[PDB]
């Protein structure tokens, strides 16, 4: 019978990461964390096969342990720590600020950004419930338990989150006429304006629209409500989730 297992193989490692089929059998198993195995991207891999600073994996585990890197305010000496969707990455020495975020196609990209923007981050409500003295509180796609959250904070609402203080400043409500980046399935990594929301009896569907004027649906859990009406609360990549088509 199966237990929780250490040795991740390549092939079985996810198709986000752009791993070689060669260069060994094993990939770096992510540590347990906020994000899931499949959606996330570690910081062993981040420094090897995007920014290309650490050529060997010995050199990558060096620089995390010098404590140059900072995931999201905190230092993190652990490495292979899962980091995925809207996490800030402050780096010491020749410091640069990143935000991790999807491509057109579904792949991960890495994006140099302004420091005043790179304070905050977004956080979608997955689960809302009551607990301790009639108080409502919220889990996020991280797993940040935001207790004493305000009203008008239901499921599938984003929360802008100030990072220096544990605050929730805005709340971008789910609606028709609201921009949303899809974050799973076939339409992963695509911007869309939300034309229709179809309630599904029991276990619901949401129809979207590029600036080009393509159209595509998805499951409701995949959409991440990025900002209110055309203009989002974030620096988007090249092409902006439009995806080429000839």
């Amino acid at each position: 019978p199966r237990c929780q297992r250490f040795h991740l193989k390549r092939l079985t490692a996810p198709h986000h990461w752009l791993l070689a089929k060669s260069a060994g059998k094993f990939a770096s198993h992510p540590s347990t964390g906020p994000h899931k195995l499949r959606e996330c991207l570690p910081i062993n891999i981040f420094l090897r096969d995007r920014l290309k600073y650490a050529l060997t994996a010995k050199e990558a585990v060096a620089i995390v342990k010098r404590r140059l890197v900072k995931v999201d305010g905190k230092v993190r000496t652990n490495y292979r720590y899962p980091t995925g969707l809207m996490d800030v990455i402050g780096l010491g020495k020749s410091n640069e600020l990143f935000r991790i975020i999807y491509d057109c196609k579904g792949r991960f990209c890495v994006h140099h950004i302004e420091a005043k923007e790179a304070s905050f981050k977004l956080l979608r409500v997955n689960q809302f419930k009551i607990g301790a003295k009639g108080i409502p509180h919220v889990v996020t796609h991280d797993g940040r338990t935001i207790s004493y959250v305000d009203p008008s904070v239901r499921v599938h609402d984003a929360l802008k989150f100030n990072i220096k203080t544990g605050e929730v400043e805005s709340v971008i409500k789910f609606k028709v006429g609201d921009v949303a980046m899809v974050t799973a399935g076939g339409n992963v990594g695509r911007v869309g304006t939300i034309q229709k929301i179809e309630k599904q009896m029991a276990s619901d569907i949401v129809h979207l629209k590029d600036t080009s004027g393509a159209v595509f649906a998805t499951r409701i859990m995949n959409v991440f409500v990025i900002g209110e009406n055309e203009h989002p609360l974030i620096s988007l990549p090249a092409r902006e989730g439009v995806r080429p088509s000839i």
């Binding site: 290309k52 600073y53 060096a62 620089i63 010098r66 140059l68 780096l91 010491g92 020495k93 020749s94």
Partner: peptide
């Protein structure tokens, strides 16, 4: 060519 400042090289 890239200026890796973390191992300043």
């Amino acid at each position: 060519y890239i200026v890796n400042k973390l191992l300043d090289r």
